[PDB]
Amino acid sequence: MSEKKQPVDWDDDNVEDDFSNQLRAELEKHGYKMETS
Amino acid sequence: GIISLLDEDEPQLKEFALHKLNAVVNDFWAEISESVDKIEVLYEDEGFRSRQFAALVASKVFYHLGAFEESLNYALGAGDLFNVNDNSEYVETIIAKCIDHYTKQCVENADLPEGEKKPIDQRLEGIVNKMFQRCLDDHKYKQAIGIALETRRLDVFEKTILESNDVPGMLAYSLKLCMSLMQNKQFRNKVLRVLVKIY
Amino acid sequence: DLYSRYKKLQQELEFLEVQEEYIKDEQKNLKK
Amino acid sequence: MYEQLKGEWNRKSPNLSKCGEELGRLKLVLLELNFLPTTGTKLTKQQLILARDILEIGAQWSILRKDIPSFERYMAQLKCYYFDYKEQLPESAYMHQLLGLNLLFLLSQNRVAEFHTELERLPAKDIQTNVYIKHPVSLEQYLMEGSYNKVFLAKGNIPAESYTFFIDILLDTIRDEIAGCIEKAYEKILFTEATRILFFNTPKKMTDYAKKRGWVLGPNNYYSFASQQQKPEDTTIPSTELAKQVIEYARQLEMIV
Amino acid sequence: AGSGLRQYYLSKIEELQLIVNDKSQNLRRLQAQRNE
Amino acid sequence: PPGGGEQEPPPPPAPQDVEMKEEAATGGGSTGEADGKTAAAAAEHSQRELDTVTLEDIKEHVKQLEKAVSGKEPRFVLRALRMLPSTSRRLNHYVLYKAVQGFFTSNNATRDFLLPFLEEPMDTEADLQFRPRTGKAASTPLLPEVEAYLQLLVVIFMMNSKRYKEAQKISDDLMQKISTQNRRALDLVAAKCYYYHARVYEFLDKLDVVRSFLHARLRTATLRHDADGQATLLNLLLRNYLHYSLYDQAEKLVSKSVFPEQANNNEWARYLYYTGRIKAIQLEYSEARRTMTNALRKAPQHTAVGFKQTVHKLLIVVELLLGEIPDRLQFRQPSLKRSLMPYFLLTQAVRTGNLAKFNQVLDQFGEKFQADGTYTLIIRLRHNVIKTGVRMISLSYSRISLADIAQKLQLDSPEDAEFIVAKAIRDGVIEASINHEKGYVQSKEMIDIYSTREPQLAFHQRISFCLDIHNMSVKAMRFP
């Protein structure tokens, strides 16, 4: 069925859920968290 | 909407508002419905100029919503301003339902003719007989006789059979119907006796 | 004309209704 | 036909006979050639320019006299004229600020639901320029967040005329809504906490709430009726209706043959 | 008189036709169940 | 010669046979189900109409030279169908026109002979018994003249032919066909007419005249009964109310006609999409999201139908205001090209606290957002971000000092934090409680138990459903 709505205007890793840039990798954050105390 | 004018109690404005409004009720049929109290009030009080006109627009709005009982009531109240009309879907629908209400009322009252019959608003006859006359502007339409028997009215029955072409084949047709497919003896014998008299 | 068709429609409608009630009852007893 | 076009408006308009002049105008316009029609004519166009101007003055006099029903009536009529099946309508200079004032009225009388649905018609004049429309939407945005003090800070900046007749009512409604949000079951709350809130005079309006609302008027130890609510669902007897339901299931397990 | 009452006696029977039209089929279904 | 003469043999054979036998079988079935089984709603009539809507429409746009489909009109132009020889000779005329077209050049229409192929078609002792055939063969010529994709010298003809067909069907239904209910087809006709009116309102003024005509059209329905008639007229009219005149919203809110329960499933999706749009624009968000999701799964099963894209571009904004979307779940192969460029950048900005990036994306894609007719986002989404933060705080902590949320939600002050949390609780996003004494915010009581009177309230609904389904199934079993 046609609705006259003119619809027409990379990795197979699947869902990525939610990733947000942390920049510091865990190794850096914990590596220098320990230094404080 | 133009109800913005009905807000004012000046008598000159009111009728201009109603006259302008009933010209557009169909496009804005539902929109109006949040105002029917105002129109009903302006119908109920005495001394307005066109109380029938308010009754008419009320009937139109309630016919939109299919509240046929109340459209019927206000159409009775709307008087000749409505009743004189004769060719539209709206009028034909509400006159059909009026015929229905009338015939059922008649059938009900016919079981207790001795008294305490519920009142009949004479406007019901004022519409029914008008339709009967339409069924008289014609040579011998069978349907006229049909409604006649269905409404227990021997008078218009007789007037129709004697009027027009009183071909005895037609009264043999009437006897055939009386015998073939009706059974309430107390009405049967009455119809049969008026038929023997006319014969 | 139309009066006869109207009346006959009414009659056959109600009569098939009667048959329907009959059939329901006979079902109920045959099950027992 | 030019019934005192600028009789009492250019210099000062305190007249109450202006009401009688408007009455005559409304009695005369109903007999004008075209009001309902939309096909139009140049003469009709003149009749429409006239009707628009007179309705504008009627609405502004309404706000000047602080009448509400006349305000809403005139505004409905004018808004029916402004948008319509016929809208050739060379631009009128009062359209923007009057419409903004209409939006202020709609916001003040706590019809926020009907606020946005009127804002669909304006494609670009509501953001880029035209301060008159900018003001009410900005105030609405301010009052959508819990921010409140900024409203009272920014009250003293109105691009059009005073229009205070609505701004006072808006402030009162905001006050009473904020009060209602602080719905308190406990009858005892420190009145000084309310004193921090924008209630202003310590007992002038505290008595007003005290007469009907709970707590005390500036006590700092409120005593009154409590708004605590308990479900009281201890009763284990919905038996009369639950039995209905069960019998109904038995009803539709049978009677099909 | 130019089809005085053709819009009556005609819109009145259409519902009758539809009702009986479906109800006969329902009756035949019940017939089959009882027989088996 | 090598491109016209050599490509002529292949084309002529297929339209000569397959289309003709198609419409032959469809007309035969229509005649059979109109003659017997007056309750002919359940038949291949609807399937035939759907197939004609789907298949025959797209096979050709040009006037179909060599008298393959343009010849059907000169075939059936003279039809009597009074008795056995008349109908047999009309079928023989169809066959002979096909044979002549495959042998020689049959009758051709030069963009002006369609009226004589339409006037004479209803002339020459035409048969009323095939009123549906008249409608079908009159509407099919519309689509060629409609889907000519030229919009020159055919839109006006489209409008005139549409008016002709509308008048014909109105006069036909003025007799109130008995035991036939041609409305089962008429609806499609109606939709078709609306099509050209939109095309007309794409080549000329909008469909307000159509609006009046269709108010009359549904009024003449809803009186006797409803058979798929009003179920189409309602969504047609509120489509036009919202068609670039969508600024009108106030009215349709009072369209209080009940929507018929038993409708074609495809239409229910249009109805629920428009109901969702109207609910969300006037700021109700509870019902809007649930009814829109109910719409999406109602009838999406097709290979990229197209408006699913739009419902997704709405459900994302309408539920952004209240929570979180499936952030990466729904960006798959069909929608990926559009949704991703603006909406993904948005929801990504929204979860983060970057206001500047929000402004950047808004500046970049405001034109696209307005083109879609969903520019509510700036109106409310920009100023309702803090709601999500409050929701997260509700989900994690259970007892917190309100002096801490300020540093957690960058409000910089505790009192306005009290105000905003109180507003949130009143709005019902969270049911926490506040100790107005020492900056104490506490969650509600623990979840009491999940097995006291709240469960069985659901099982009652499921029984209602299941027993209803079984009864519906058993009733309509084996008609003969």
mmCIF file with all atom_site columns, N, CA and C in Angstrom, chain E:
data_model
loop_
_atom_site.group_PDB
_atom_site.id
_atom_site.type_symbol
_atom_site.label_atom_id
_atom_site.label_alt_id
_atom_site.label_comp_id
_atom_site.label_asym_id
_atom_site.label_entity_id
_atom_site.label_seq_id
_atom_site.pdbx_PDB_ins_code
_atom_site.Cartn_x
_atom_site.Cartn_y
_atom_site.Cartn_z
_atom_site.occupancy
_atom_site.B_iso_or_equiv
_atom_site.pdbx_formal_charge
_atom_site.auth_seq_id
_atom_site.auth_comp_id
_atom_site.auth_asym_id
_atom_site.auth_atom_id
_atom_site.pdbx_PDB_model_num
ATOM 1   N N  . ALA E 1 1  ? -47.164 11.032  -7.550 1.00 0.00 ? 1  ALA E N  1
ATOM 2   C CA . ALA E 1 1  ? -46.817 12.425  -7.302 1.00 0.00 ? 1  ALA E CA 1
ATOM 3   C C  . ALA E 1 1  ? -45.306 12.604  -7.232 1.00 0.00 ? 1  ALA E C  1
ATOM 4   N N  . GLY E 1 2  ? -44.605 12.089  -8.236 1.00 0.00 ? 2  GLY E N  1
ATOM 5   C CA . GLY E 1 2  ? -43.161 12.200  -8.293 1.00 0.00 ? 2  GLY E CA 1
ATOM 6   C C  . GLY E 1 2  ? -42.442 11.467  -7.178 1.00 0.00 ? 2  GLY E C  1
ATOM 7   N N  . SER E 1 3  ? -42.772 10.187  -6.990 1.00 0.00 ? 3  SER E N  1
ATOM 8   C CA . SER E 1 3  ? -42.173 9.343   -5.955 1.00 0.00 ? 3  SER E CA 1
ATOM 9   C C  . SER E 1 3  ? -42.390 9.955   -4.568 1.00 0.00 ? 3  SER E C  1
ATOM 10  N N  . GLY E 1 4  ? -43.665 10.000  -4.185 1.00 0.00 ? 4  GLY E N  1
ATOM 11  C CA . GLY E 1 4  ? -44.022 10.642  -2.931 1.00 0.00 ? 4  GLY E CA 1
ATOM 12  C C  . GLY E 1 4  ? -43.398 9.973   -1.722 1.00 0.00 ? 4  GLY E C  1
ATOM 13  N N  . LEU E 1 5  ? -43.477 8.645   -1.653 1.00 0.00 ? 5  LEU E N  1
ATOM 14  C CA . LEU E 1 5  ? -42.984 7.889   -0.504 1.00 0.00 ? 5  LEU E CA 1
ATOM 15  C C  . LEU E 1 5  ? -42.084 6.743   -0.932 1.00 0.00 ? 5  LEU E C  1
ATOM 16  N N  . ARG E 1 6  ? -41.254 6.962   -1.950 1.00 0.00 ? 6  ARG E N  1
ATOM 17  C CA . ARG E 1 6  ? -40.273 5.949   -2.309 1.00 0.00 ? 6  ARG E CA 1
ATOM 18  C C  . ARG E 1 6  ? -39.080 5.935   -1.363 1.00 0.00 ? 6  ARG E C  1
ATOM 19  N N  . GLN E 1 7  ? -38.802 7.040   -0.677 1.00 0.00 ? 7  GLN E N  1
ATOM 20  C CA . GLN E 1 7  ? -37.745 7.064   0.326  1.00 0.00 ? 7  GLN E CA 1
ATOM 21  C C  . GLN E 1 7  ? -38.196 6.481   1.648  1.00 0.00 ? 7  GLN E C  1
ATOM 22  N N  . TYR E 1 8  ? -39.397 5.929   1.664  1.00 0.00 ? 8  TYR E N  1
ATOM 23  C CA . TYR E 1 8  ? -39.959 5.216   2.790  1.00 0.00 ? 8  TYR E CA 1
ATOM 24  C C  . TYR E 1 8  ? -40.513 3.933   2.196  1.00 0.00 ? 8  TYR E C  1
ATOM 25  N N  . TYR E 1 9  ? -40.652 2.902   3.028  1.00 0.00 ? 9  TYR E N  1
ATOM 26  C CA . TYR E 1 9  ? -40.918 1.542   2.559  1.00 0.00 ? 9  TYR E CA 1
ATOM 27  C C  . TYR E 1 9  ? -39.711 0.958   1.835  1.00 0.00 ? 9  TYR E C  1
ATOM 28  N N  . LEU E 1 10 ? -38.665 1.755   1.624  1.00 0.00 ? 10 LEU E N  1
ATOM 29  C CA . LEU E 1 10 ? -37.487 1.289   0.905  1.00 0.00 ? 10 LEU E CA 1
ATOM 30  C C  . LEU E 1 10 ? -36.241 1.316   1.770  1.00 0.00 ? 10 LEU E C  1
ATOM 31  N N  . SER E 1 11 ? -35.976 2.425   2.453  1.00 0.00 ? 11 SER E N  1
ATOM 32  C CA . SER E 1 11 ? -34.920 2.422   3.451  1.00 0.00 ? 11 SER E CA 1
ATOM 33  C C  . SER E 1 11 ? -35.322 1.628   4.680  1.00 0.00 ? 11 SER E C  1
ATOM 34  N N  . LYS E 1 12 ? -36.606 1.302   4.815  1.00 0.00 ? 12 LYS E N  1
ATOM 35  C CA . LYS E 1 12 ? -37.081 0.541   5.961  1.00 0.00 ? 12 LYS E CA 1
ATOM 36  C C  . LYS E 1 12 ? -36.792 -0.949  5.829  1.00 0.00 ? 12 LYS E C  1
ATOM 37  N N  . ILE E 1 13 ? -36.747 -1.483  4.604  1.00 0.00 ? 13 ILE E N  1
ATOM 38  C CA . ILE E 1 13 ? -36.607 -2.926  4.433  1.00 0.00 ? 13 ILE E CA 1
ATOM 39  C C  . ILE E 1 13 ? -35.164 -3.372  4.253  1.00 0.00 ? 13 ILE E C  1
ATOM 40  N N  . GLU E 1 14 ? -34.239 -2.448  3.998  1.00 0.00 ? 14 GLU E N  1
ATOM 41  C CA . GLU E 1 14 ? -32.861 -2.846  3.747  1.00 0.00 ? 14 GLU E CA 1
ATOM 42  C C  . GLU E 1 14 ? -32.249 -3.532  4.963  1.00 0.00 ? 14 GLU E C  1
ATOM 43  N N  . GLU E 1 15 ? -32.499 -2.985  6.153  1.00 0.00 ? 15 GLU E N  1
ATOM 44  C CA . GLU E 1 15 ? -32.018 -3.625  7.370  1.00 0.00 ? 15 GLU E CA 1
ATOM 45  C C  . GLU E 1 15 ? -32.620 -5.011  7.539  1.00 0.00 ? 15 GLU E C  1
ATOM 46  N N  . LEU E 1 16 ? -33.908 -5.159  7.230  1.00 0.00 ? 16 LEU E N  1
ATOM 47  C CA . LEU E 1 16 ? -34.535 -6.473  7.305  1.00 0.00 ? 16 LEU E CA 1
ATOM 48  C C  . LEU E 1 16 ? -33.816 -7.462  6.403  1.00 0.00 ? 16 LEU E C  1
ATOM 49  N N  . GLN E 1 17 ? -33.514 -7.038  5.175  1.00 0.00 ? 17 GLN E N  1
ATOM 50  C CA . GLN E 1 17 ? -32.824 -7.918  4.244  1.00 0.00 ? 17 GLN E CA 1
ATOM 51  C C  . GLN E 1 17 ? -31.478 -8.350  4.803  1.00 0.00 ? 17 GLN E C  1
ATOM 52  N N  . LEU E 1 18 ? -30.696 -7.397  5.311  1.00 0.00 ? 18 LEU E N  1
ATOM 53  C CA . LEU E 1 18 ? -29.373 -7.750  5.819  1.00 0.00 ? 18 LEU E CA 1
ATOM 54  C C  . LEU E 1 18 ? -29.468 -8.697  7.011  1.00 0.00 ? 18 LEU E C  1
ATOM 55  N N  . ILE E 1 19 ? -30.391 -8.413  7.930  1.00 0.00 ? 19 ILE E N  1
ATOM 56  C CA . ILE E 1 19 ? -30.502 -9.219  9.138  1.00 0.00 ? 19 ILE E CA 1
ATOM 57  C C  . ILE E 1 19 ? -30.836 -10.656 8.783  1.00 0.00 ? 19 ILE E C  1
ATOM 58  N N  . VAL E 1 20 ? -31.864 -10.853 7.959  1.00 0.00 ? 20 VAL E N  1
ATOM 59  C CA . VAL E 1 20 ? -32.240 -12.227 7.659  1.00 0.00 ? 20 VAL E CA 1
ATOM 60  C C  . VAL E 1 20 ? -31.166 -12.902 6.820  1.00 0.00 ? 20 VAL E C  1
ATOM 61  N N  . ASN E 1 21 ? -30.475 -12.128 5.977  1.00 0.00 ? 21 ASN E N  1
ATOM 62  C CA . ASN E 1 21 ? -29.418 -12.676 5.143  1.00 0.00 ? 21 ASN E CA 1
ATOM 63  C C  . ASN E 1 21 ? -28.340 -13.330 5.990  1.00 0.00 ? 21 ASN E C  1
ATOM 64  N N  . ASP E 1 22 ? -27.921 -12.674 7.071  1.00 0.00 ? 22 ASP E N  1
ATOM 65  C CA . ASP E 1 22 ? -26.902 -13.316 7.905  1.00 0.00 ? 22 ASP E CA 1
ATOM 66  C C  . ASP E 1 22 ? -27.484 -14.409 8.800  1.00 0.00 ? 22 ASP E C  1
ATOM 67  N N  . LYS E 1 23 ? -28.718 -14.219 9.260  1.00 0.00 ? 23 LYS E N  1
ATOM 68  C CA . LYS E 1 23 ? -29.246 -15.113 10.274 1.00 0.00 ? 23 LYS E CA 1
ATOM 69  C C  . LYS E 1 23 ? -29.527 -16.496 9.699  1.00 0.00 ? 23 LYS E C  1
ATOM 70  N N  . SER E 1 24 ? -29.857 -16.577 8.405  1.00 0.00 ? 24 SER E N  1
ATOM 71  C CA . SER E 1 24 ? -30.038 -17.893 7.793  1.00 0.00 ? 24 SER E CA 1
ATOM 72  C C  . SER E 1 24 ? -28.743 -18.698 7.795  1.00 0.00 ? 24 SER E C  1
ATOM 73  N N  . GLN E 1 25 ? -27.622 -18.049 7.482  1.00 0.00 ? 25 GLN E N  1
ATOM 74  C CA . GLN E 1 25 ? -26.343 -18.744 7.511  1.00 0.00 ? 25 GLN E CA 1
ATOM 75  C C  . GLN E 1 25 ? -26.046 -19.259 8.910  1.00 0.00 ? 25 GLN E C  1
ATOM 76  N N  . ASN E 1 26 ? -26.311 -18.428 9.918  1.00 0.00 ? 26 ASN E N  1
ATOM 77  C CA . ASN E 1 26 ? -26.095 -18.886 11.289 1.00 0.00 ? 26 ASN E CA 1
ATOM 78  C C  . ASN E 1 26 ? -26.930 -20.135 11.586 1.00 0.00 ? 26 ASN E C  1
ATOM 79  N N  . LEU E 1 27 ? -28.194 -20.130 11.155 1.00 0.00 ? 27 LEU E N  1
ATOM 80  C CA . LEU E 1 27 ? -29.051 -21.289 11.386 1.00 0.00 ? 27 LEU E CA 1
ATOM 81  C C  . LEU E 1 27 ? -28.493 -22.541 10.722 1.00 0.00 ? 27 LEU E C  1
ATOM 82  N N  . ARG E 1 28 ? -27.946 -22.408 9.513  1.00 0.00 ? 28 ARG E N  1
ATOM 83  C CA . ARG E 1 28 ? -27.426 -23.599 8.843  1.00 0.00 ? 28 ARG E CA 1
ATOM 84  C C  . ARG E 1 28 ? -26.208 -24.156 9.577  1.00 0.00 ? 28 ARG E C  1
ATOM 85  N N  . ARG E 1 29 ? -25.385 -23.271 10.141 1.00 0.00 ? 29 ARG E N  1
ATOM 86  C CA . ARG E 1 29 ? -24.266 -23.750 10.951 1.00 0.00 ? 29 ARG E CA 1
ATOM 87  C C  . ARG E 1 29 ? -24.752 -24.592 12.126 1.00 0.00 ? 29 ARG E C  1
ATOM 88  N N  . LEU E 1 30 ? -25.747 -24.081 12.852 1.00 0.00 ? 30 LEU E N  1
ATOM 89  C CA . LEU E 1 30 ? -26.276 -24.856 13.973 1.00 0.00 ? 30 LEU E CA 1
ATOM 90  C C  . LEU E 1 30 ? -26.841 -26.192 13.502 1.00 0.00 ? 30 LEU E C  1
ATOM 91  N N  . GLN E 1 31 ? -27.493 -26.197 12.337 1.00 0.00 ? 31 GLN E N  1
ATOM 92  C CA . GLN E 1 31 ? -27.998 -27.443 11.769 1.00 0.00 ? 31 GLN E CA 1
ATOM 93  C C  . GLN E 1 31 ? -26.895 -28.487 11.683 1.00 0.00 ? 31 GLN E C  1
ATOM 94  N N  . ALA E 1 32 ? -25.755 -28.094 11.116 1.00 0.00 ? 32 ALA E N  1
ATOM 95  C CA . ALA E 1 32 ? -24.677 -29.062 10.924 1.00 0.00 ? 32 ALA E CA 1
ATOM 96  C C  . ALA E 1 32 ? -24.172 -29.603 12.254 1.00 0.00 ? 32 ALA E C  1
ATOM 97  N N  . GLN E 1 33 ? -23.984 -28.717 13.234 1.00 0.00 ? 33 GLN E N  1
ATOM 98  C CA . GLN E 1 33 ? -23.471 -29.181 14.523 1.00 0.00 ? 33 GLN E CA 1
ATOM 99  C C  . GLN E 1 33 ? -24.413 -30.199 15.161 1.00 0.00 ? 33 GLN E C  1
ATOM 100 N N  . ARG E 1 34 ? -25.712 -29.898 15.157 1.00 0.00 ? 34 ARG E N  1
ATOM 101 C CA . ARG E 1 34 ? -26.665 -30.830 15.744 1.00 0.00 ? 34 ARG E CA 1
ATOM 102 C C  . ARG E 1 34 ? -26.626 -32.170 15.035 1.00 0.00 ? 34 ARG E C  1
ATOM 103 N N  . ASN E 1 35 ? -26.532 -32.154 13.706 1.00 0.00 ? 35 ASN E N  1
ATOM 104 C CA . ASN E 1 35 ? -26.538 -33.413 12.972 1.00 0.00 ? 35 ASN E CA 1
ATOM 105 C C  . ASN E 1 35 ? -25.375 -34.299 13.390 1.00 0.00 ? 35 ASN E C  1
ATOM 106 N N  . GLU E 1 36 ? -24.170 -33.731 13.448 1.00 0.00 ? 36 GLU E N  1
ATOM 107 C CA . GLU E 1 36 ? -23.030 -34.586 13.767 1.00 0.00 ? 36 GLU E CA 1
ATOM 108 C C  . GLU E 1 36 ? -23.145 -35.147 15.181 1.00 0.00 ? 36 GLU E C  1
#
